[PDB]
Structure formats: structure tokens, C-alpha cells
Amino acid sequence: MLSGLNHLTLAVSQLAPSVAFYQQLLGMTLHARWDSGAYLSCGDLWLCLSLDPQRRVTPPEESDYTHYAFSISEADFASFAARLEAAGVAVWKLNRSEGASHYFLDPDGHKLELHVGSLAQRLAACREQPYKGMVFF
Amino acid sequence: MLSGLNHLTLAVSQLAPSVAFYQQLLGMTLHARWDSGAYLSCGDLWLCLSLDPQRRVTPPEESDYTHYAFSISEADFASFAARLEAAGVAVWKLNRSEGASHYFLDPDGHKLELHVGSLAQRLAACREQPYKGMVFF
Ligand SMILES: [C][C]N([C][C])[C][C]OC1=[C][C]=C([N+5](=O)=O)[C]=[C]1
Ligand SMILES: [Mn+2]
């Protein structure tokens, strides 16, 4: 039986700007680096950056909706979003729902999100106003 | 302050075969499904499947090393991997060894992994046989 997410690995085109982004801008802990990768943590999350000559810097129009959302408290949300804006980090989507989300891109065009709230909160909101075709189990 | 992964969203080309893969084959818990997505959980992980007509199925040889690893116990690893092979799930290959892992593809070509072990265990293993140029912090 699977017990959760073990690690998330992102392919990166250049290690130094990606380490700067995840460690310095986003505040993750850097545990180790080598010639072709790095290991970081963010709370319980184990993040691996893997240098990959196949990775292209991808504009958001040319990638699909696959994305990775990080947890943040509502109290910290606005100041963290403002930090990303000061650093010139690009936004790939406006939040058009109820709930706090900020959609931003990493240096290689991986699609990231800051989100406040849990699965249980989302399910409760959907029970009140379900999406088209929605069935609960 | 970021505190971990809030959710992982995968773009899928066909909802029904993807829900079947994650729920019926991988054993994740299905909480809700609607015409254009589904919510599942795997332990603490909130997984969203999002129907996206922009999702393309790319051979693993021409997609980058971005991948998602799920935790499994030492006792369950071999039998779970055998069940995936018996079900005809395709494999892919990483450029480096990272311990006890099985690498497999989902129906849309997302790169998945079963892995036994924590970040702390990986760091201890790397201290005994480091990658090229490795530094520990
Ligand atoms: C083609 C998209 N949809 C049109 C109505 C099909 C929906 O079809 C199902 C929904 C839910 C379950 N179910 O909950 O197992 C099974 C089938
Ligand atoms: Mn999201």
C-alpha cells in the first residue's frame, strides 16, 4: 500500500538559478548538492532538482495544467506573493475561485502555486456548490 | 513560510482511465469525481486529476526527468512492483541510482516511482557512496 508522496523531482536546465530560486527565494532547506542535482526539503516535502539536458525553459502556453502547490498560511500569503512580485517572478494564471491561490513559474517554467486550505475544506465547499457532474464517495 | 506540498495536479487526456489507474491499480482513495476532474488522496497527499486536452503522451525517452515518487514499505515493495508488471504497466529509466525504486508510467506518460526510504536514509547512503562533486550542508 502506498503511504504518501516520497519525493518530487523537477528536471532543471541550470542548477545554480534553480537552487537560488528554491533555497533563497522560496526559503527551502538545502541538504546536499552535487554536479547534477540537489536535495532540498520544505516541511515534510523532499524536493530533488535534477540537471537534465532535455529540459527546456517552457513558456506557460506550451505546457499543460500539471502543477505543484505549496502550503502557506493565510496570514503569510500576501507578503509571500509580494516577495515573488518584487523578484519579477511570472504569474501564469489568475485565481478565479474562492480561496487563496497564487500561480507562479519557476526558472524552467514548472508551474507552481501557493495555496491556503486543505482537501477537507475544498470538499466542504464543493458539497455546497458542486462542479458539473460531481459525485462524492 | 512554506510548510510542504499542498496538492499535486496532473493533467490527463482521458479522465476515466486515469481515475481507474490511480484508484483501482494504485489503491488511492477516491473522494470525488466530476466531468473534468477528480480528487484522490494517498496518505497525506492530495492528488488532483484535471482533464486537459493539451496533454500529450510523449515517449519517456523524449520527456525530461521530472517525476513523482510514492512511499511504500520494504515488506510491500516487491509484491507491489510485481503486480504493476503483471498488469502491463510500462517502465522508464532514470540516469542515476537512488536506492530501492521501481519506475513506471501512468496512462498519460507521467513518470512515477515506488521508493523505499526517507530523505535522511538517502543522505546517509550518499555519505557512504557520494555522487560526483557532492557536498553536504
Ligand atoms: C464522458 C463523461 N461523462 C458523461 C456523463 C461520463 C461519466 O461517467 C461516469 C461518472 C462517474 C462514474 N463513477 O462514479 O464511477 C462512472 C461513470
Ligand atoms: Mn492547484
Ligand SMILES: [Mn+2]
Ligand atoms: Mn526518484
